[PDB]
Amino acid sequence: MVFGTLYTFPGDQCRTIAIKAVAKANGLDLDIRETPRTPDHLSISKLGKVPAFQGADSFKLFECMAIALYITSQNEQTTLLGKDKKEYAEIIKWMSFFNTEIVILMTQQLLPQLGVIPYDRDQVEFFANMTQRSVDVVEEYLQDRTFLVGDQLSLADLFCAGNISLGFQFFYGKAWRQQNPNVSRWYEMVCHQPIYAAVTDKFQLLDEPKLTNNP
Amino acid sequence: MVFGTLYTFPGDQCRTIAIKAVAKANGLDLDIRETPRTPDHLSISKLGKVPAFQGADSFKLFECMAIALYITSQNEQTTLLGKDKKEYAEIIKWMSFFNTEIVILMTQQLLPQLGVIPYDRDQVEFFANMTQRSVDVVEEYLQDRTFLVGDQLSLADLFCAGNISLGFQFFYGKAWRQQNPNVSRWYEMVCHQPIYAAVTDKFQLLDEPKLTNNP
Ligand SMILES: N[C@@H](CCC(=O)N[C@@H](CS)C(=O)NCC(=O)O)C(=O)O
Ligand SMILES: N[C@@H](CCC(=O)N[C@@H](CS)C(=O)NCC(=O)O)C(=O)O
């Protein structure tokens, strides 16, 4: 049967890819609802935030990290949560870092350029820079590393790749990829893992950025 | 011996209380460094962010959630990480929700009123409101609940109480506590748990808020 219901937006959302991916890998079928702010969604997330999740259980969850972790843990033989307590903590670290120091700031960089939140290039430039100095941490970390954590694919690879994909959809052109080769190489690798590619549209990179200022 | 080193600010910092508390409960001694941005701190957190942690191991960690979880997990008999996979996920949820939907917004409410980041009352009012509608989720959730997760104290109680304490230091006067009785009652309860009170200054609540606008 269906293991539960996941409320999200249409397509390949930054905070949802990794959740779909580990569900299909662990053999848990999800019903996907792509219409936010319905009574059943707000029953989980009173604020109407995506992603939100309800088990067939009807066990309720919000926060993308919690949903990803709960799904992943269903498989007591999983390989994706590290070898030992150290590596588990590293996975928590990178998930939390990508969710707060990259996605949040990149969103402040992006929304003004789409019209959503009010616009100001001096403010938009501030966030582009802060976003980039956080990504720089990852660029340098991945020098001579293949995976974020240990020697095989983990939930952090899938979750954080999914997060950063926002950057590859809008800002990260060939030029950017030239200055950020390790992140580019790692991202491109995660996106070609079967577990991840199974639940996403076809991989594709920008030539020119779709965005600079002003709009 | 010392289990490791924790870099933080002086006193009862929103993202550190819970880390000190579970360390002293699990019998792990920490060296506490209260001077940020030293070479050994930036060796962990290149961005100079607090909290950061280095084991005697010299296992390195940043992100308060990851540090709290790593310390807590050292005690394979711990009671603080829930009964089963459902409750573990609930703890992740509340930790992540408090860290992003409350502390982050409350910080945007606070900094302009202290001079740090530029000031604007229309913007400061926006964040006060968003902060409060996230706290409202917790107020309503705690109606007829004692603990955030299950029937006993958990890491989420300690971590999230520690987070929200920022609100009690600056904005949450007797008036506020009247409109938010469940959060007030729960917070006051966590702050009197020995594990938590052991590593904090003496509990104390505001009468009038220390802050409104303008400054
Ligand atoms: N702290 C949440 C953030 C979730 C979030 O903010 N989602 C956005 C979409 S990416 C949303 O649903 N916004 C609707 C709203 O904020 O009202 C998490 O980590 O899961
Ligand atoms: N995502 C981090 C946030 C840590 C953070 O931003 N800490 C603040 C103090 S509360 C800091 O150190 N700021 C210094 C800076 O940003 O340069 C976490 O959850 O641990």
From Swiss-Prot, chains A, B:
CDD domains: GST_C_EF1Bgamma_like, GST_N_EF1Bgamma. Residues 84-215 form the GST C-terminal domain. Its cofactor is glutathione. GO terms for cellular component: cytoplasm; nucleus. It is an enzyme of class 2 (transferase). Coiled coil: none annotated. This is Glutathione S-transferase psoE. It comes from Aspergillus fumigatus (strain ATCC MYA-4609 / CBS 101355 / FGSC A1100 / Af293).
